[PDB]
C-alpha cells in the first residue's frame, strides 16, 4: 500500500526519530540527566560520544534534545547551534556559522573585534546555550585548534553556561589533542559499542519493520505484524541475518538490507517472502573485482593469465609490458599455434585499457619521464579471484583454461 511505503521509507532512508532505544539505557540515562543539569542549572559540562560509524550517535543526541525540549522552561530559553566537521573546515567558516545561527548577524554587522575570543564573548552576551559538534575529529586538524580551546575555555571558566557535546569515530581522540586543551577537557567518555548478541539482533529485525499503532487501517496493520512475527522465526531469514551479523553489528547495514527487501513489495505481492530477503542479501554481497574481470575480452584474460604466471614464477618482483608480451607470445607460438596471433600495438592498447580501469598500478608514478614500455607495473588481483572469475566466464575457450591450470 502507499502509506506503508511512506512510513517505512521515512524509517530507513531519512533516518527519523523513533521512540525505541536499544541497549543504551545507562548511556541515554546519564546523558539525559547531565543535559538536565546543564539545562535547569548553570552547570557546564563537556562529553565526547565515541563510537563507530552508524551506531546511533545522532539518534541519541536528537532524542535527548527532543525529550529535553518537551519541558517548557528549557523550551523558552535554550538556543541550539549544530556544527558539522565537513562543512566548517576553517576557524572563519565556523565563527560565521555561530554568529549566524544564534540570529545575531544583524547585531554584529560592521563591528570589528580585536580577537576571536572577543568576537565569541560579545556574541554570547546577547541564558543557557547548547553546542553540538558533529565530526569532532576534523577540528583536531586545523592550524592551531583555536576553536576547540575557545569552546573549552568558555565552558570551563566563563560564567555563561555552555554545553559542548562531541561526536567522533576515531577511538584515539585523546591523542590528537594538544596537551593544554586536554587539560581543560573533562575526560567524560560515553561509549556506544554494539553491546548486544544475536537473539537481540533478531528482536531488532522484528521490531524495525513493524507498523506503528497510529496507522489508520488497523486490520492490515495486525495482519502485517503477524506476518513479520512469522518471518522472525524463519530459518531462511535467520541464515542471512547470521551472515550479515557476522560481517558487522551496525544497524545501518540492517536498514539498507531491509530497504533493498522492501523495494520489491507491490499491490501484486501484498506480503513479504523469504526469497525476497534472499534476493536482497544476494544483491548486497556481490564482489566487485571478479565482476569487473567478467566484463573483459579474451585477449584481456590471456594477458591476466600471463601476468599471473609472472607473479608465480618471478616471486614478488615487478614487471613491464614486454615480459608480459613474451609470455603471451610463448603461449601463442607453441600452445595456441596460429590462434590469437595478434600484433604488437593491439596488445599495447589492451594493456592501456587495463591501466585505464586501475587493475594495474605504477610502483613509481612519473608521467612522461620514461616511455610506455620499460616501466614497472604490479598486479592488483589475488590468484583465487582470477580462477573464480575465469570459471564463470561466458564463452571461455578450452585452450585458455588449459593454459590457466598449467
Amino acid at each position: 500500500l502507499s502509506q506503508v511505503q511512506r512510513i517505512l521509507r521515512e524509517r530507513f532512508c531519512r533516518q527519523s526519530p523513533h521512540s525505541n532505544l536499544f541497549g543504551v539505557q545507562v548511556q541515554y540515562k546519564h546523558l539525559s540527566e547531565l543535559l538536565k543539569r546543564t539545562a535547569l542549572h548553570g552547570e557546564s559540562n563537556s562529553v565526547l560520544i565515541i563510537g563507530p560509524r552508524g551506531s546511533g550517535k545522532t539518534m541519541l543526541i536528537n532524542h535527548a534534545l527532543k525529550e529535553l525540549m518537551e519541558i517548557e522552561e528549557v523550551s523558552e530559553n535554550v538556543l541550539q547551534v549544530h556544527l558539522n566537521g565537513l562543512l566548517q573546515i576553517n576557524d572563519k567558516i565556523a565563527l560565521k556559522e555561530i554568529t549566524r545561527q544564534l540570529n545575531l548577524e544583524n547585531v554584529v554587522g560592521d563591528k570589528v573585534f580585536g580577537s576571536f575570543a572577543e568576537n565569541l564573548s560579545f556574541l554570547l552576551e546577547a541564558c543557557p546555550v547548547i553546542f553540538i559538534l558533529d565530526e569532532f575529529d576534523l577540528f583536531a586538524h586545523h592550524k592551531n585548534q583555536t576553536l576547540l580551546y575557545n569552546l573549552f575555555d568558555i565552558s570551563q571558566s566563563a560564567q555563561t553556561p555552555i554545553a559542548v557535546i562531541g561526536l567522533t569515530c576515531r577511538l584515539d581522540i585523546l591523542e590528537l589533542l594538544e596537551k593544554r586543551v586536554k587539560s581543560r577537557f573533562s575526560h567524560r567518555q560515553i561509549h556506544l559499542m554494539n553491546s548486544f548478541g544475536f537473539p537481540q539482533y533478531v528482536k531488532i529485525f522484528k521490531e524495525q519493520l513493524s507498523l506503528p499503532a497510529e496507522f489508520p487501517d488497523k486490520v492490515f496493520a495486525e495482519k502485517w505484524n503477524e506476518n513479520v512475527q512469522y518471518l522472525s522465526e524463519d530459518r531462511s531469514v535467520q541464515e542471512v541475518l547470521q551472515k550479515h551479523f557476522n560481517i558487522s553489528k551496525n544497524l545501518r547495514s540492517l536498514h539498507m538490507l531491509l530497504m533493498l527487501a522492501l523495494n520489491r513489495v507491490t499491490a501484486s505481492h501484498p506480503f513479504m517472502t523469504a526469497v525476497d530477503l534472499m534476493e536482497a542479501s544476494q544483491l548486497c554481497s556481490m564482489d566487485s573485482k571478479a565482476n569487473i574481470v567478467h566484463g573483459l575480452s579474451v585477449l584481456e584474460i590471456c594477458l591476466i593469465i600471463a601476468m599471473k604466471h609472472l607473479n608465480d614464477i618471478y616471486e614478488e618482483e615487478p614487471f613491464n609490458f614486454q615480459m608480459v608480451y613474451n609470455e603471451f607470445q610463448k603461449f601463442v607460438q607453441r600452445k595456441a599455434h596460429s590462434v590469437y596471433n595478434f600484433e604488437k600495438p593491439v596488445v599495447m592498447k589492451a594493456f592501456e585499457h587495463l591501466q585505464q580501469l586501475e587493475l594495474i598500478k605504477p610502483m613509481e608514478r612519473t608521467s612522461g619521464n620514461s616511455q610506455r614500455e620499460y616501466q614497472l607495473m604490479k598486479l592488483l588481483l589475488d590468484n583465487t579471484q582470477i580462477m573464480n572469475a575465469l570459471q564463470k566466464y561466458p564463452n571461455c575457450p578450452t585452450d585458455v583454461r588449459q593454459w590457466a591450470t598449467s
Binding site: 592498447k349 592501456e352 585505464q356 608521467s367 612522461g368 616511455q371 610506455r372
Partner: protein, 593 residues
C-alpha cells in the same frame, strides 16, 4: 690588462674624442696591387649577393605558401561536417611537422597566422607551454586572446561568447610547442571540448618538432580517439635552389666540379640542411673575387665589356698571363700570337668576342641539359641519375659518351614504344618554348617535324637526334678559353674551411712534429716535453715519471726534468687524454687510438 683576478676587462676609447672608425674596405684590401680594382670588385660582390639573397627569400616563400594552401583546403572540409545533434563528431587536428631547428619557428607560424586569417577564419590564436602549467591558466589565456581578436572562466563560458558575436566561422588554436606541455593539461582539454563541440567548433594545430610518434606518448588512446589526425610537412628544396641559382644563364658566376662535390657531400652525408649550402657559396663567391684581380669582369655582358676598355696595364698583363689564354695562343695561327701580346688594343678587342663566345656557351649548355633531363628521367632505371643535380655532376666531370655510362643509356632509350617518345617530345618541345632568345632556334624547328611525324627506322632518328645534340653542345668547361674569370676551383681550401677535424690534428702534432717543425725532428726522440709524455704513454705516474727521465736525458744535478714532467702531465689533463683513477696513482687510456 688581460691577466688580473677578474674575468671581464673592457677597453673603451675614452679621453680621445675621435669616434671615427676604420673603413670595411680598408680591412678587406691589404696590398699594393690595384686599389681601385679592389673597390669596384666588392661593389660587384655586394650587388651579386643582394641578387642571391632576394632569389633565395622568394624560393622559400613559394614553398611555404604551397604548404599553407594544403592546410587551408583541409580546414574547409572538416567544417562541412559542422555545417550539416552532436552525433559524437570528432575534433579535427592537423599535425604540422616543421624542421629540427626551433629559432625559425617564430617566422614559420607568423606566416601561417596571416594565411589563415584571410582564408578560413577571422579568429586564430596561439598558445604557449611556458604560460600554461594547469587548466586554470590555460583557459585564462585562451579567452584573453579570442576576446582581443574580436574570473573563473569555463568551457561553458566559452560557448556563451560564441553566440555573442557570431549570432559560423571556426576558431583555430595553434599549439606551437606540443612537446613542452604537461601531460595532464592535454588529456583534460580534449575531453572537455569534445562534449561541447556542436556549439563550439574546434580545430587544432600541433607543433611537432620531433618525429610524429610524440602524439602517442603524451596522449593515450582513451583521449586520442576523440581526434582525427592529418600530417602536414629537404631534397626537393635542394634541387629547386640549385636550378634557380647555378643552372640559370641569368647569373654569371659558376662553380667547378670539386667545389660542387664538396658542397654536395656535406649535405646528403651529414645534415640535410639547405642553409649551409648557401654558407658554402658565400665563401666560394668570396675567395674568387679576392684572390684573382681580374674578377672585375665577372658580370653581365653590358657591364662586363665596357670594363675591358678601361683597364690598367698590370691588369691587362694579368689577362695576358691567364693559363687558359696561353693554351689558346699556342694553337692559334702563326701571325696572331704577336698581334695579341705586343698590342694591348688587339688584346682587348679579342676579349669581347671571347667573352660572348663564353656567354653563349652558358645558354646552349643547360637547355640541352633540361632536354636531356627529360629523356633520362623518363627512362625507368635512372642510370646516370634521377635528379637534375645528379645529371649535372656526371656530365660536367667528363664527356659522358667518353665514359661507358652513356652507352647503356643510349641502348635503353633506343628500344621504346611510340607513345613514350610522343610523351617525351611533348615535354621536350615546351622546354624550347619555356626559354626564349634561342640560338638553337634551328633545333627548335627540327624536333617539331619530329613531333609532326607522329617505324623502326624513324625512332632511330630521334634517338640519334638527341645523341648528336649531346656531342655538339655539352663539353667540360675547362675546354673553353678564359673560363677562369667566371670559374673558381679551390677544392681543398674549401674543404679545410668547413669539415675540419681536431682529433686527427691533435694526434698528428704529438706523433710527428716534423710536419710542422721542419728541423729534422723525426724521420720514422728529439721532441718537446708535451710529445714525449704522449708516445711513451702509448700506467702509474711514478713509472711514467722515471721513464720520462731516461728519454729526456739521453738527448742531453737535474731537478727540472721532474718539473718538466709536471707541466707535461697537467696540460695533458686539460686535454681529454688523462683522468685520475684509484687503482694505481693513475691508470687511464681513454684515447684508445
Amino acid at each position: 690588462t688581460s691577466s688580473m683576478s677578474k674575468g671581464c676587462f673592457v677597453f673603451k676609447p675614452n679621453s680621445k674624442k675621435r669616434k671615427i672608425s676604420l673603413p670595411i674596405e680598408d680591412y678587406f684590401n691589404k696590398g699594393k696591387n690595384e686599389p681601385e680594382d679592389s673597390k669596384l670588385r666588392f661593389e660587384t660582390y655586394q650587388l651579386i649577393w643582394q641578387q642571391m639573397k632576394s632569389e633565395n627569400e622568394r624560393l622559400q616563400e613559394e614553398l611555404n605558401k604551397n604548404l599553407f594552401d594544403n592546410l587551408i583546403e583541409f580546414l574547409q572540409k572538416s567544417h562541412s561536417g559542422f555545417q550539416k545533434q552532436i552525433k559524437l563528431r570528432e575534433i579535427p587536428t592537423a599535425a604540422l611537422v616543421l624542421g629540427v631547428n626551433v629559432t625559425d619557428h617564430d617566422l614559420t607560424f607568423g606566416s601561417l597566422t596571416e594565411a589563415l586569417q584571410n582564408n578560413v577564419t577571422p579568429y586564430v590564436v596561439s598558445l604557449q607551454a611556458k604560460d600554461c602549467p594547469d587548466m586554470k591558466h590555460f583557459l585564462q589565456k585562451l579567452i584573453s586572446q579570442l576576446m582581443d581578436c574580436c574570473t573563473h572562466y569555463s568551457m561553458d563560458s566559452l560557448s556563451s561568447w560564441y553566440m555573442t558575436v557570431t549570432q559560423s566561422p571556426p576558431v583555430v588554436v595553434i599549439l606551437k610547442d606540443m612537446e613542452s606541455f604537461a601531460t595532464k593539461v592535454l588529456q583534460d582539454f580534449i575531453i572537455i571540448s569534445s562534449q561541447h563541440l556542436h556549439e563550439f567548433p574546434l580545430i587544432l594545430i600541433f607543433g611537432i618538432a620531433t618525429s610524429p610518434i610524440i602524439i602517442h606518448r603524451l596522449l593515450p588512446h582513451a583521449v586520442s580517439s576523440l581526434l582525427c589526425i592529418e600530417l602536414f610537412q629537404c631534397k626537393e628544396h635542394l634541387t629547386t635552389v640549385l636550378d634557380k641559382l647555378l643552372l640559370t644563364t641569368q647569373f654569371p658566376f659558376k662553380i667547378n666540379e670539386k667545389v660542387l662535390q664538396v658542397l654536395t657531400n656535406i649535405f646528403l652525408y651529414h645534415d640535410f640542411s639547405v642553409q649551409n649550402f648557401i654558407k658554402g657559396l658565400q665563401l666560394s663567391l668570396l675567395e674568387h673575387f679576392y684572390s684573382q684581380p681580374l674578377s672585375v669582369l665577372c658580370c653581365n655582358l653590358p657591364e662586363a665589356k665596357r670594363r675591358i676598355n678601361f683597364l690598367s696595364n698590370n691588369q691587362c698583363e694579368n689577362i695576358r698571363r691567364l693559363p687558359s689564354f696561353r693554351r689558346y695562343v699556342e694553337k692559334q695561327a702563326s701571325e696572331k700570337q704577336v698581334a695579341l701580346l705586343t698590342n694591348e688594343r688587339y688584346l682587348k678587342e679579342e676579349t669581347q668576342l671571347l667573352l660572348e663566345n663564353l656567354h653563349v656557351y652558358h645558354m646552349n649548355y643547360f637547355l640541352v641539359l633540361r632536354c636531356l633531363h627529360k629523356f633520362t628521367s623518363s627512362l625507368p632505371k635512372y642510370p646516370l641519375g634521377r635528379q637534375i643535380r645528379e645529371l649535372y655532376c656526371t656530365c660536367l666531370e667528363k664527356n659522358i659518351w667518353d665514359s661507358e655510362e652513356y652507352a647503356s643509356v643510349l641502348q635503353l632509350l633506343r628500344m621504346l614504344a611510340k607513345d613514350e617518345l610522343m610523351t617525351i617530345l611533348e615535354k621536350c618541345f615546351k622546354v624550347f618554348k619555356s626559354y626564349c632568345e634561342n640560338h638553337l632556334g634551328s633545333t627548335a624547328k627540327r624536333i617539331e617535324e619530329f613531333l609532326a611525324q607522329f617505324f623502326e627506322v624513324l625512332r632511330e632518328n630521334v634517338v640519334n637526334f638527341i645523341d648528336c645534340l649531346v656531342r655538339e653542345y655539352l663539353l667540360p668547361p675547362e675546354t673553353q678559353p678564359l673560363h677562369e674569370v667566371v670559374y673558381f676551383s679551390a677544392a681543398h681550401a674549401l674543404r679545410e674551411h668547413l669539415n675540419a677535424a681536431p682529433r686527427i690534428a691533435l694526434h698528428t702534432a704529438l706523433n710527428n712534429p716534423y710536419y710542422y717543425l721542419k728541423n729534422e725532428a723525426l724521420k720514422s726522440n728529439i721532441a718537446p716535453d708535451i710529445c714525449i709524455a704522449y708516445k711513451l704513454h702509448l700506467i702509474n705516474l711514478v713509472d711514467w715519471s722515471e721513464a720520462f727521465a731516461t728519454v729526456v736525458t739521453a738527448a742531453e744535478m737535474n731537478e727540472i726534468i721532474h718539473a718538466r714532467f709536471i707541466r707535461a702531465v697537467s696540460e695533458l689533463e686539460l686535454l681529454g687524454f688523462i683522468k685520475p683513477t684509484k687503482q694505481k696513482t693513475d691508470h687511464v687510456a681513454r684515447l684508445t687510438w
